[PDB]
Amino acid sequence: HPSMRLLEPNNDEFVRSVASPRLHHSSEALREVKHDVRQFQASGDRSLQQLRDLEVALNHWEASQPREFAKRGGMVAELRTAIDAYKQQLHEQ
Numbered sequence: 001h002p003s004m005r006l007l008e009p010n011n012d013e014f015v016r017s018v019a020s021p022r023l024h025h026s027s028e029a030l031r032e033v034k035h036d037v038r039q040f041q042a043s044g045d046r047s048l049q050q051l052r053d054l055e056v057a058l059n060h061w062e063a064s065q066p067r068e069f070a071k072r073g074g075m076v077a078e079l080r081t082a083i084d085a086y087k088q089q090l091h092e093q
């Protein structure tokens, strides 16, 4: 599944997609999402507990920062699809 490239450890497409070139500050909710993407990557995609945290952190961002989410969240569906694929792979062992 090509969504999986988004949490391949070297991949920066998701964090680029939530950057503001006009240099608007990221919410704490968005900074926790970006940090959780990098933490999952750091192990080479081995932690289901970290992957869960990323999924919860995306829900918190969507709930708490609607305007930032709607504006910066264009790659969220694809990242959530990648999360599910790595969940399947870790469930399979």
Ligand code: NA
Residues within 6 Å of the ligand: 055, 080
């Ligand atoms: Na989800």
